[PDB]
């Protein structure tokens, strides 16, 4: 009967990753046999995708070969964390979506206490397609997230753009901002211990609206590794390898158009 049935012994395996893309009020959800993909977009330039594969869930059954509904992400996250944001004391989740015109059902249980949520779903609007293929990627860098987490959290937000330079030559990998105070450059050498993979065949310099890229910090903090790619269009791809509380690996992705 139910189009989508998902269950978790630990609700944080869903809520934690969703928080990393929470920079808009609403989000589009896609449920296939692979798992759940939640998409958040803004200004038709930036898009964040959270991927929670079926293997994460203790139970994940889907009927039709694609179930898509839009929802209030803020309300969803409020409900998923209804028993607190800092609990061996877990909170089980059972997620049920009947179909079009029906609300998303959430059954959360902690210590015998049961919270039942029913969130109405809106008309899904067309999800942007950034058409980002690996066969068109010019430069690619994989970094240890820990050594970049706090340096990124500090980039001057008074600046309008974040300029990313990737090059086979010095400074190899540079993040630049241009705010009121002046110029600021953050450089990572290709020989660095933070640099796990360096594949820059061509010098590329792209600029992106920093307001669009700022929420990706949330993903960076949760990630253990981060992959940075630009293509022949200048489009940016940020992929975050996230290890949840069960040691399982899920992914968050950020696309952003050039400025």
């Amino acid at each position: 009967q139910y189009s989508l049935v998902a269950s978790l012994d630990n609700v944080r395996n869903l809520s934690t990753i969703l928080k990393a893309i929470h920079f808009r009020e609403h989000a589009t959800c896609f449920a296939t046999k692979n798992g759940i993909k939640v998409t958040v977009e803004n200004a038709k330039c930036v898009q964040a995708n959270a991927f929670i594969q079926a293997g994460i869930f203790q139970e994940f059954k889907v009927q039709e070969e694609s179930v898509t509904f839009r929802i209030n992400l803020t309300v969803l996250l409020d409900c998923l964390s209804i028993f607190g944001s800092s609990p061996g004391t877990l909170t089980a989740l059972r997620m049920c979506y009947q179909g079009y015109g029906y609300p998303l059902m959430l059954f959360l249980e902690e210590g015998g206490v049961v919270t039942v949520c029913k969130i109405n779903t809106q008309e899904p609007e067309e999800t942007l397609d950034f058409d980002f293929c690996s066969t068109n990627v010019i430069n690619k860098i994989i970094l240890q997230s820990e050594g970049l987490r706090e340096a990124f959290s500090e980039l001057d937000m008074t600046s309008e753009v974040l300029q990313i330079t990737m090059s086979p030559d010095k400074p190899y990998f540079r993040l630049s901002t241009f705010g009121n105070a002046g110029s600021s450059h953050l450089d990572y050498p290709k020989d660095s211990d933070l640099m796990e993979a360096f594949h820059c065949n061509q010098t590329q310099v792209n600029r992106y609206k920093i307001s669009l890229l700022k929420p990706s910090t949330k993903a960076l903090v949760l990630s253990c590794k981060v992959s940075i790619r630009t293509d022949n269009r200048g489009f940016l791809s940020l992929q975050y390898m996230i290890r949840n509380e069960d040691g399982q690996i899920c992914f968050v992705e950020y696309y952003c158009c050039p400025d």
Partner: peptide, 10 residues
């Protein structure tokens, strides 16, 4: 929409 295509050296 397509599932994730990881670019990590896995």
């Amino acid at each position: 929409t397509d599932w994730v295509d990881p670019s990590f050296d896995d």
